[PDB]
Amino acid sequence: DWRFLTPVQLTDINDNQHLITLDALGRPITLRFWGTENGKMTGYSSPEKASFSPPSDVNAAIELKKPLPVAQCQVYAPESWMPV
Amino acid sequence: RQYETSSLPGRLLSVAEQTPEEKTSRITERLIWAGNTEAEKDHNLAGQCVRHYDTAGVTRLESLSLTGTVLSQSSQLLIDTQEANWTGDNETVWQNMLADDIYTTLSTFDATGALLTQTDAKGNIQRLAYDVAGQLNGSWLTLKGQTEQVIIKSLTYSAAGQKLREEHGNDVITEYSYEPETQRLIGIKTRRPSDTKVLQDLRYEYDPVGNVISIRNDAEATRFWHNQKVMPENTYTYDSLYQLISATGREMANIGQQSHQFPSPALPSDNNTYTNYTRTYTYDRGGNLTKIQHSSPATQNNYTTNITVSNRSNRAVLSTLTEDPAQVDALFDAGGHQNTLISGQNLNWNTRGELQQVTLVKRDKGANDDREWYRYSGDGRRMLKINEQQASNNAQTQRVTYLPNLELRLTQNSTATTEDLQVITVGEAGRAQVRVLHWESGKPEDIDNNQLRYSYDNLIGSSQLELDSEGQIISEEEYYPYGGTALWAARNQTEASYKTIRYSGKERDATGLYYYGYRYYQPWIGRWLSSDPAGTIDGLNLYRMVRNNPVTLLDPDGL
Q1: Which site in B68, B279, B281, B372 is 20 to 30 Å from B3, CA atoms measured?
Q2: Contact map slice: A 11-40 vs B, CB within 8 A
Q3: According to the lineage, what is the superkingdom (chain B) (predicted)?
């Protein structure tokens, strides 16, 4: 990701892709990986097929439904300390 | 050792060794490594050792997960009469050193890498479920050709991640009580909801450090207790160095003196009783246990174990091998391995310091010595246990092969196979392990097939109560603090004969010797059979028992 000069898509030795999405200011938001295990592909659906919109609020994020095509989706609330 | 050349990464290729008596080295280990070819990419094997030749046989890696774990692995043992000597460069040759009996296990993991499904080498399948916290919350087992059974109906954990509630497939429920101030187990309650019967009700009283100073069992004495109901506390006394000095508990009246021979279980028809005993432990300045004084006034068992400790090492034996501190070292080899277990039983240590053989009965030059012998894999794991009786009309061989989650107990008489039993393990020993006994041959007349054994473990993982699929008692056992048997009873001696997990979850071998991974333990002494490898022990006494305090295995993080 050339905005940060940090790696975001990693190709393994094996047939295995490991990808992350960063937000502005570069914090990791999502993780996906996929590849073959026994000559056939499994893992997480790639992002060009399985789109995903991370939740905004933390309280909103808590209530997600099961078919979530992502690992370790991050939600940040660095500003939760300010009164609003 | 032989490593790859500079055109390569420099990974290990082989291990060779030579004893002083030999002219050449032998190849005991050899590693064939995966490259970066398409097949390897397909099975996620690139760069991995895929064919590992060792001292036990050959281990073959067939498939890895996207998470880096094992999905498919297979293996073969060495022919009993063929040593590992994987010379030359031809696997065709190496194959002829092996049995053609290949075992394979298969697995399925989630994205996290938690194990979800495991197929053993006979086709039996374990299935695991996890909760929202990623914790194991239940478990099932399907035997090959059978339906799926529930082994664990439910698990609940505390805030600390500790097991709080356990519900077994046999309807037995175990509740765990933790002291909330310290987050440590304070009690165990095992009950049958079918008849609201409490089988175990334990409490652990501790000093300020965390040593258990008393164990109470509020459960009632069971069916094997002839007109007895209430048990005393297991009181423990410790010194300033926290060595166990004294302890109390119950023992079978007919248990006799402690030795390497395991006692017969009491049966419910015997009408035996148990006595109240105290045992005292004396230690020298190096932490060596020098004397064990038994006292059980009901039978006036005043048996004393006298230990002779070397005056130039921390090595020690019972007085039966020698009385002289100047001679004690003569009983050990150069690496600190014990040469003889008990008088007459010789110990053969191999080139890796592992116990290769135990002579059980010394005979003439006609009849062979009874013996036990072993094979270990290239990680020090025991893979094969062979018990050879040489009696001409009773030369029974008990061949036990260890596989992940599977123990194969093959028994033959001097002419032919008498029993073929698969033991399927679900869970870890000392951690509420449940076993299934599946026979392909030789099932005893009074034993149902696909028999379940539910182990109800104590504070340190010793197995005290064994229940069946109906929540009934199969067996009951109490131990001396150092692992001897204080009390043993069972519903059926036939069933009793199959319990091998006894102390701190470890296997009691035929000789009375316990197996602990890399070392063996002698409960009649309170010492390790051989010195531990330097650097794995922080103290100086390489034969010392876990801090002379077997009551509390205070080994946080497994250390």
Answers
A1: B68
A2: 13-16, 33-39
A3: Bacteria
